[PDB]
């Protein structure tokens, strides 16, 4: 795209080949943020267009993420190409003071859940669900950071609506609703118990901002609480008609 704006680095993750996917694109954003926090910023911005990575080669690097064996030199099969189509209006997120590799933890976490959210909706349940793209972001024509990093901000499309907490990481339950619930309940059962979603948020059945517990506890950010976190869901959950349709078992 020709117009005035600025240059970016755009990470997608695959979770289907468990690889990364790289890109370009230009942006703008807004000088203003529409939401704070006492960790983030969020920012209105427009894409300008995405485009491949071939002018920006990514060279061989030695202490950054992620390695080169866990990128797909492929790129042609991705969402970015569409979803953030020029013209197309988003959020920009910007966490203050916390490493690379967690930033694009995040990423791989949204995928992941994105993922078992289709996984769900297979099995033709009452209500379908959808995960929000996200997708890592390196704002180069911007000067670095203290450190000799680059920019990094993490990006998603406009959630537009009345926003929702149904449950949280820790086992709290904030929604009468039941499907949210089952759909938690569904990914520890059917992960054989190796990992559950929790933290579903979002518009409706428009989810965002989740977070995977795991019983070993590693991977997925420091929102996982591991073998605590899992317990905390299911002494607190109650089988609905959902978690029935599924053929979900009531022990946990
Ligand atoms: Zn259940």
Known sequence: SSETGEMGILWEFDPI????????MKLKVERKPFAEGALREAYHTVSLGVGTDENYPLGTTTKLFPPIEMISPISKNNEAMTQLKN???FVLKLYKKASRELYFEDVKMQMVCRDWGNKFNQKKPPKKIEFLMSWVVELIDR??????????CSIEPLLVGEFKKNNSNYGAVLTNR???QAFSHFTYE?????????????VDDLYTD????TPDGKGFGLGNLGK???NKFITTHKCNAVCAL??????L
């Open 17 to 24: 080949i468990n690889k990364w996917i790289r890109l370009s």
């Open 87 to 89: 013209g197309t209006k």
């Open 143 to 152: 000067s670095p950071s203290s450190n000799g990093q680059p920019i990094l």
């Open 178 to 180: 039941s499907t949210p």
């Open 190 to 202: 059917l992960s054989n118990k190796q990992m559950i979603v929790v933290d579903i948020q979002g």
């Open 210 to 213: 989740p977070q995977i517990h």
């Open 228 to 230: 605590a976190g899992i």
């Open 246 to 251: 599924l053929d979900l078992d009531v022990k």
